[PDB]
Amino acid sequence: SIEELAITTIRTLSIDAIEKAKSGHPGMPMGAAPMAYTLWTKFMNHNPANPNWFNRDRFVLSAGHGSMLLYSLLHLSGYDVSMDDLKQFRQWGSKTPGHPEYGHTPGVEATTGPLGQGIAMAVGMAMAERHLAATYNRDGFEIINHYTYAICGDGDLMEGVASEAASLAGHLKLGRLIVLYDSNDISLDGELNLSFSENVAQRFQAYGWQYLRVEDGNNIEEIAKALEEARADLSRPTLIEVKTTIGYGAPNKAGTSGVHGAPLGAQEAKLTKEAYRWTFAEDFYVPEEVYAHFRATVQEPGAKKEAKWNEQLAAYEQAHPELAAQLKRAIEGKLPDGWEASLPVYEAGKSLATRSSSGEVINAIAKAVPQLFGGSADLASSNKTLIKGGGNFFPGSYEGRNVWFGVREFAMGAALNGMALHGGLKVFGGTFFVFSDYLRPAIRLAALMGLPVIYVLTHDSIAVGEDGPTHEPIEQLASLRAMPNLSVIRPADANETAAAWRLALESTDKPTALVLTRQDVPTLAATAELAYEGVKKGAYVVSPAKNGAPEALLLATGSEVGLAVKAQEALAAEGIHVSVISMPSWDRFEAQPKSYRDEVLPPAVTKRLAIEMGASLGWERYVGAEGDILAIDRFGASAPGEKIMAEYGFTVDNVVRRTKALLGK
């Protein structure tokens, strides 16, 4: 049968590439190839000629170690994955990295490897599909309509982020999300029973999922059957548990954890090929009949599906020209001409938390930017993230723009990544800066994939006060500044906050963390003028010395900028002139040339005090060896916030006092 031979071809390309690499994970591709074959050639709607076709079904390999299965299917389907690419598995600069990397392989929809997260990112994709369908499907035109598939394994189902995401997806009745569970009773350290014994069916049923079981993971009629039932039932996400033998066919290693994560070896790979009836003498061998089978089943149907969808789009264009022009910009990642003029501008004196001015920026933008979409992990009323009038994102009204993620920071991070990968949306999530730790691995995959997600991180310091040190960030700032390709902006007032929002929405290729206060911040007088370009360049001179030549520089961020300005005013009354530097974003300031940075931090002004309510790690770069740091390198406390700040030294007097010491006065 041609189906069997395609499946053996997949199994054997995967083995050989892993042998040549002397590295990788054979056991999962060997057992999962039939289910992956069946989904890829019989149910999934995609076009190898255009992996960016916007209405394609989205596929996610959550069990990322199995990546040679993905690459085998990509290559045989005619994606731009060549045979030489498969012979470069796990090699420097290749298009077949050991775990799936989005942006490095055509057709790969998401970077996985960190277990659990792929499922949750698929949930994100399925949410973007329903929200987009409800925004653009009008008057008989079903322009957004597609499934989200994922293959996961035992480890994915032990990770909490996948529990969070399954709960959320079932709650939202995401009927177009179908997960195939590679259920092989094996994890990395040995038998599944070492660590895991849940009734997975009963658990996914408690979330509101359709559960289906495949007894024989090699029987493609039982698999295709399960897939038909899953695609039929659009009222619930589906989990298809497919019982497999890890390393199926290896006479000595099938069913053992030894086959999870190291090459079969030349001896056992020979015996496996014999067990497969794979007669052929050559390695990396694909019979022409297999390329032909894949042409017939995938390449050629895929191009007609997309052609036929291009026809429906052209008619929608003519029927609904504005709506289609909006959709086309959304797909292209563009914002509506002139949206930015809708941003608020705040006068000096006006005092409100930067979480509150964030709240106002959001609603101001939300009208001008239809593509904005997001929410909070059960803190909308504290983070100030609600889009008023925007609607609740619910199965009865997927057009609603407010997502109620629940107390699931980590699912929220990864769903956000998934929505951004889908395309068509600008997306944000809110929580307390301290609990940004709960989604830390999702922030990392955003950075690695270069996804311009936006984190709304409020309650940024010890000024939080009474809820105490579990709720008071100290190190989180430093911990994000050290992450590559993560933009971090801690705006100093309402105007820097609108600037920060603007830059974050203009980002195309990296996540932005917005660090915001619980407590009021009075608006500075220069920021209305300078914030957008000032924040654009990471740091600037928000308040220059009045006598032009500063005797020392005060360096501050967020709320502390106001503190430093009031110290400046006290100091100049005494005849001591300093320049205050706002430093809303280290990463963007380091992106500028030294010509600019030297205009902000003039080398001749060696006396520099840093002022920031957070760990000191890193501050020596900017204050230098004659400078001083006023920071916090200890945990906080449970007390009114202005009192903590005082006992920790963030007072006008102590700033003046430390500045005077720097100058020998």
Place this chain on the structure above:
Amino acid sequence: SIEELAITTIRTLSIDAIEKAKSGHPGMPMGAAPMAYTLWTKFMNHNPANPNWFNRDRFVLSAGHGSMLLYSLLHLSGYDVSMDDLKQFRQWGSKTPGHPEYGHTPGVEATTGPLGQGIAMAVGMAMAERHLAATYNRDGFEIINHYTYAICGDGDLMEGVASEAASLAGHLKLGRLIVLYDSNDISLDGELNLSFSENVAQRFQAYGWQYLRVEDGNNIEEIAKALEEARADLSRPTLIEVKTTIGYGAPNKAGTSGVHGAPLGAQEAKLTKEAYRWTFAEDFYVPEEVYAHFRATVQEPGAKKEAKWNEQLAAYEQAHPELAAQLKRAIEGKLPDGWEASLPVYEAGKSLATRSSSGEVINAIAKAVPQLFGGSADLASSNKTLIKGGGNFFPGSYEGRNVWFGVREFAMGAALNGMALHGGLKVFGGTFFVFSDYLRPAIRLAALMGLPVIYVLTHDSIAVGEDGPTHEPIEQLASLRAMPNLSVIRPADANETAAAWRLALESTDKPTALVLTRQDVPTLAATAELAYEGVKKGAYVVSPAKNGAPEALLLATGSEVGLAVKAQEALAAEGIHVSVISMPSWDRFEAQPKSYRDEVLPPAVTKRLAIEMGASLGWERYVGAEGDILAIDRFGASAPGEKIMAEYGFTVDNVVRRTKALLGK
């Protein structure tokens, strides 16, 4: 009824404390007072006169926003929490912080606030209780035998950490763990149905838990019946869903999310006490007959119980004097005198990954230190954590010392906090450094509570190779360096690894992260002699300049110390003389006096190159303004590790070219 009157006292005290603080969370205490009084006064075995009684039931309030419910029961029961303490809720330095703080309050077993983690810490405590029962109990002496209780809310049960922990606890059949779920259909933003609609009972049964439902959370008899059923089924852990009205008794605010986290206000407070029939008209008032009731239900029974256990203990001493002697030492936190003699010492040049030398050290410490208990998150084969011959921690064999946490990093981390809090064990957990992000919030809780937990974090760098950038740490070091009260050690070789393990085990008041390699690192010349004092001082000259007069300093950590010594050798062969500095721990170095710091880092020697395969943040502190940093501020790649390290510039020839450039040579 005296029962009602005590329950109403709890409620009023909670309301009054929040009013006076003008901050706090009345909703949960108001709804959950009955269940907590029932557990506290009728089932828990505890002694207010000794909160450290070792065989007490352990209680954790996972829903830590309800702190005043805990402080009320502690005050009323005769723990060292005064009325003045209750009147200082949420104030500076007070014994009643806004969320419970272990070590800041008598009777408080864990710091909570961050949702989900309370349940998983309680799982760890129950794990501790069974490992210690299996170790010390003998026929006729069930000397270790007590329950673990927690109270959680809806938010706890959305958190991934509590799904992981529940799964593991069901798998481990921890029948003595009983969780009371305050099920009030409300969360912080509104109704539970915004975000959460699952069948909790069905999910928890899928884990292997017993599920019990109390329909009227004010009926203390129905609560008592569930606790009796739950305490009687020791084959499974129990979840009791207690249907409660949040803010019960407040005629306006009961059952709304506005009573979650703000004071009632004086009006609603008056109206609430009216509904309760509380007519004393004095804030912070306790009827004398309520104290007397708690003294009859808690104080006197508690002293009798500990006293009976102490009689038991002395009987156990007589019949099993050696085990009783070992038990007493474990309880008091001591290590077997002389244990450190057992640590291995490695000849120079012996070449071994520090994960493998960690493995060796682990089994050396384990043979000499019975109380060592630990495991990995499905990465024992790769982290090298297995205790050989130590047995498997299962219900067959709770005396087994190897714990299979599964792919549950965060539950692992939180459960380690639980075991350290219980007392009597030295605990560790293994996973990839890059996946330490998955347990970040529990690392923070260890630091905050000062628990000498040990993290075994292998695969520390790009040397990991073919698995790619999702698996290669970059920023993790900087992220842990910035955290208060966390010790981070990245040993240079096998001897610094031995010394690191020794210091992490010797710790009493802070956790320790061990940053270990995948790849071999040769053992340096001088570490056999210098490692212990050297790592103890955080940084030390490991290879001083041959001629005694350094032209520059090479600063390095971990596997890069090797590289630095080769460069030094090459440099010396051209007439250039540099000193090499090992810095296994920044935190330990900063704890040295300046006189010693200036001796390792002579202010005279301005020309310094730091060398570390991770983010640059904070190295300017040690290289200074005329310094240079050879670091990695980008993500990694999929390739053989050697290939990546060379492309990223960690080669002998490149360190030499940098050093010469520093010296204008």
